[PDB]
Symmetry: D2
Subunit: 101 residues, 4 copies
């Protein structure tokens, strides 16, 4: 079934590599509208990359970089230290685009 | 900034409709999108995505969609975070649908 | 740069298979995807989008899909331009599909 | 049925102004999207958003587009945009 996600945003932090081996960062995607006082909210979207795509993100992207992301939405579920269940939704990037020279 | 999500899937359960303290309709359902590839043993697994609609979009999805209905969703990916009963910080990301298309 | 198209529609005709100078099979069909809004005349028009598939995916669409089959298409949008006898130009726009989903039974 | 197109590229010229028979304003530009050789995709915007694009974007500017795909006739298919997002 069809599953497609496209985002442009800026990384909140420097990307992490993680593992089997996965590259990870979170993208702040400003909304296109504001309230009457110009306050603009954002969404903080976790993205995961693999292989050379994971390598490209590690060598090009840093805190604050504007990036383009194209992928699938995948959901998983785990339990943590305190004994709580966490519901995870993320973008698994099929192609990431560095939008800055 | 660009924010676009398009999915096709089937509802896992029947949709729920509600009215905020302010009296606008909010519709909720979860969409199961089978993957296009297979896992290490040849299984095709699914993803279970929470979708949100408002206003007439929420009404029409409530009266027309039921458990198992094939639907296409066009919208944006939005993130929230709250502190629920047990006392947890819970991070929710969900699809806010600009248009739901009844495919059956 | 990002280039992304997601469509659902019904095939206008039955799909075509062909095999290039090299051997690879190329699948061809065009999709009628009705608009979500209405015209000044109160009913619903569609847009007719050419789709291109390759390799085994193109085989399946030839073996499974027919005129009227509802299908979903995911891919990238391509533009090229070439000619013919009247050596003047044909402007083609199409979607080359990364994945097709057959939304009806067969 | 679903019809969504999302691109990022650069305008080949400055966007143009124009209006329909019924006086509605239209802004056009063609978008040079890069493969990863380019694709050259015409984009249409409407009403006030045409005033937006004409002020914000010029030849070479990096814009993202989000919208529907539409056919017209001389066959022509364009991207009717729901929002152009000025990135540079």
């Amino acid at each position: 079934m069809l599953n497609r996600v496209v985002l442009v945003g800026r990384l909140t932090k420097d990307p992490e590599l993680r593992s089997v081996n996965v590259g990870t960062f979170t993208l702040a995607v400003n909304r296109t509208f504001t309230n009457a006082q110009g306050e603009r909210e954002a969404d903080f979207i976790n993205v995961v990359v693999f292989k050379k795509q994971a390598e490209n993100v590690k060598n090009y992207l840093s805190k604050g970089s504007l990036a383009g992301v194209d992928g699938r939405l995948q959901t998983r579920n785990y339990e943590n230290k305190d004994g709580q269940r966490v519901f995870v939704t993320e973008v698994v990037a099929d192609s990431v685009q560095f939008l800055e020279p």
